[PDB]
Write an enzyme that holds these catalytic residues in place. Structure first.
Site, PDB file in Angstrom:
ATOM      1  N   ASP A   1      13.975 -16.593  17.324  1.00  7.13           N
ATOM      2  CA  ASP A   1      13.511 -17.582  18.287  1.00  7.13           C
ATOM      3  C   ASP A   1      12.417 -16.832  19.056  1.00  7.13           C
ATOM      4  OD1 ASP A   1      13.068 -19.307  20.492  1.00  7.13           O
ATOM      5  OD2 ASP A   1      15.078 -19.040  21.331  1.00  7.13           O
TER       6      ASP A   1
ATOM      7  N   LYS B   1       2.489 -17.602  24.046  1.00  7.72           N
ATOM      8  CA  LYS B   1       2.841 -18.818  23.299  1.00  7.72           C
ATOM      9  C   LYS B   1       2.050 -20.041  23.812  1.00  7.72           C
ATOM     10  CE  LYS B   1       6.940 -21.200  21.580  1.00  7.72           C
ATOM     11  NZ  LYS B   1       8.418 -21.089  21.569  1.00  7.72           N
TER      12      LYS B   1
ATOM     13  N   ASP C   1      16.066 -29.159  26.095  1.00  9.57           N
ATOM     14  CA  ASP C   1      15.739 -27.736  26.081  1.00  9.57           C
ATOM     15  C   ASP C   1      14.994 -27.300  27.313  1.00  9.57           C
ATOM     16  OD1 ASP C   1      14.621 -25.174  25.559  1.00  9.57           O
ATOM     17  OD2 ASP C   1      14.207 -25.595  23.459  1.00  9.57           O
TER      18      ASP C   1
END
Ligand SMILES: C[C@@]1(O)[C@H](O)[C@@H](CO)O[C@H]1n1ccc2c(N)ncnc21
Ligand SMILES: C[C@@]1(O)[C@H](O)[C@@H](CO)O[C@H]1n1ccc2c(N)ncnc21
Lengths: 382, 382
Positions: free
Chosen positions: B9, B71, B199
């Protein structure tokens, strides 16, 4: 080296084999395309030894040369009161030899042979070993084998001995309810949990209360009914159609054992259908005296014919709860084992007993025990 | 030969690595004993390259030489409006190079170096690879890496490229909500089911509506808030203690960045404690101008300070339901992802939104995405 270790559920009426391959458990189908194999042996007139489906489905006028239910005799002495009672209902001869109940049959051409119960179970294990070898394309030498939680030292040893006779090094003997709990991934849960395992097999009913604590399982209490299973439900339906045939034709079906066996095979197929449909059709051409059999069975009639038997499963569940000093609400997980737990009325009764609590789901209940054995087999294979 | 495939992840704020070993998923702790690793890179004055915890916890000498949130930039062009907005809040320099937003830092002694976002993510992946190699006692060459469901072609390719730079063959790129659903075994369920994945990460909030049909996943709709996460809850608590310190002493805490960083580290520890206790203690010796800091935070105050932020998570959930043409009752499974979902008030809000429906439970929500990636990696390892 152990190679690919197999996980085997050696059941009273049916057996199942699994392996761990490419990251998951694979339950292996036999040569007849079945993921469960009857724990049966028979001998043809020519002397061929039949094991599994071919043994159970061989039409015969000689039930005395077919062997089954060896799990009722394994690891017990001839004079054990359980053995003395069981041999009254077994059609094959049981004789006292080396303190044990040996099975005596005619293997072909009048040749009488005597087998220890573990030699019969070894034949069943050989068939399971061959089923796995055909799938893997290589020889199998090692296994994890399951047994009922109540099995004592002689019974566990005799099961290992059956493995040895079959050419299997039984690395681990594990309890059937524990293997089922492992199949459902119940060992991967945090804290202390109480697990109720409701195992309704082909011939026996076992209830086990297990505790799980920091990955460790403990068998707290066991109960059930040693002579209650899916075959008893088939028999109640058999009795219903035999009495009905006597009323409709005046003919006594049981005068022809082959007609009885044909009806037994079709009744078992119809029972399985009634778990998902409300009506089943049973058809047998040239059933009795050249006359065809054609009848229907509703889910309601099937339930009515078996209601006392289905309700009787609740009593041992209440007994295990008392012996474990637990209440209904203390049960964290309900694990259903055995194809018979697929019967809607059984599922309803269990759920209602536990005030609407849903049991664990995802694994075929007839395969859960072999699945858990295969999980352990995978670890041992590396 | 793919060897032991790892599941990674690669998160905006934290990353996690798992493997399938001895029949189960194992989440691997790093060299600091942590099962999650900050997606951070820093460079010491001496020129040492720090990755993960050492990078995040280095008492600043490098606010401009500590890289994080790569990211947000990966697989995007320099002129992408998202990039142009994000660089306003990033303390390190971002420059246009080869059409992309490259990160420019001093690697030690005034030596300037420029890195593509995938080169920074490659450093994070190298750290995850080393974490898994220390555990396995052998080299790792292949991986399953997760990405957000909304990631486009350039973003998925740039993530694979980060893997290549790190010496990892990224065999499969899988969607983060999908990996969390796999962790819970939701792909092993019969019929069509609607899965709501909630999430709440350290820096991002993603809501995804998935459908599962005969083992096949489909991402139907996605929503959330790109700049809402666990770090924002820490900041609200930071603001509370900074204002309180100004009222109690007359001193402006932010005049010393080291005092701010010490408070930030202790606030993050205290927030985590308030998910399981009703009061937390924050203590810092020689906090500001040689004076010690000693304060308490209740769960009630923590909730009050963050109430608007917690309630704001419901709006994207309602938007995904509308965009998927679904009602609340159409949701079959609720999957919670991210350590922030451990906050009792967040759990209460989600459960209340879904009329008392209980979410999936049993897997640490900060590890569920890596767990799912490891489940897939296990099948690929064979
Ligand atoms: C094969 C069986 O008849 C046998 O009696 C037993 C063995 O565990 O399980 C039954 N079994 C197997 C499947 C099944 C079903 N769908 N409904 C009722 N009984 C079912
Ligand atoms: C580490 C974190 O602060 C971070 O903000 C985020 C990363 O997913 O999750 C948080 N986190 C991790 C665990 C945890 C918890 N018990 N209660 C609140 N927040 C918790």
């Amino acid at each position: 080296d152990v190679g690919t270790v197999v996980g085997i559920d050696l059941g009273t009426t049916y057996s199942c084999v699994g392996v761990f391959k490419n990251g998951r458990v694979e339950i292996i189908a036999n040569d007849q395309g079945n993921r469960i194999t009857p724990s049966y042996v028979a001998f043809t007139p020519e002397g061929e030894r039949l094991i599994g489906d071919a043994a159970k489905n061989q039409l015969t006028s000689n039930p005395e040369n077919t062997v089954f239910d060896a799990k009722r005799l394994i690891g017990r002495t001839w004079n054990d009161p359980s053995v003395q009672q069981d041999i009254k209902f077994l059609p094959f001869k049981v004789v006292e030899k080396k303190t044990k109940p040996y099975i005596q049959v005619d293997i072909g051409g009048g040749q009488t042979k005597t087998f220890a119960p573990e030699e019969i179970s070894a034949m069943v294990l050989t068939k399971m070993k061959e089923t796995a070898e055909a799938y893997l394309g290589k020889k199998v030498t090692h296994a994890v084998v399951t047994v009922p939680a109540y099995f004592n030292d002689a019974q566990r040893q005799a099961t290992k001995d059956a493995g040895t006779i079959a050419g299997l090094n039984v690395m681990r003997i594990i309890n059937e309810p524990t293997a089922a709990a492992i199949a459902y991934g119940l060992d991967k849960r945090e804290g202390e949990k109480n697990i109720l395992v409701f195992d309704l097999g082909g011939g026996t009913f076992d209830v086990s209360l297990l505790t799980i604590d920091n990955g460790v399982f403990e068998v707290v209490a066991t109960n059930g009914d040693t002579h209650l299973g899916g075959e008893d439900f088939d028999q109640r339906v058999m009795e219903h159609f035999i009495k009905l045939y006597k009323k409709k034709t005046g003919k006594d079906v049981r005068k022809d054992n082959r007609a009885v066996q044909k009806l037994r095979r079709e009744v078992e197929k119809a029972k399985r259908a009634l778990s998902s449909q409300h009506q089943a059709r049973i058809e047998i051409e040239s059933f009795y005296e050249g006359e065809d059999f054609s009848e229907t069975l509703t889910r309601a009639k099937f339930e009515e014919l078996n209601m006392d038997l289905f309700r009787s499963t609740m009593k041992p569940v209440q007994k295990v709860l008392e012996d474990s000093d637990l209440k209904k609400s203390d049960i964290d997980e309900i694990v259903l084992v055995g194809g018979s737990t697929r019967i809607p009325k059984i599922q309803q009764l269990v759920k209602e007993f536990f005030n609407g609590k849903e049991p664990s789901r995802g694994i075929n209940p007839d395969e859960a025990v072999a699945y858990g054995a295969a999980v352990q087999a995978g670890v041992l294979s590396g």
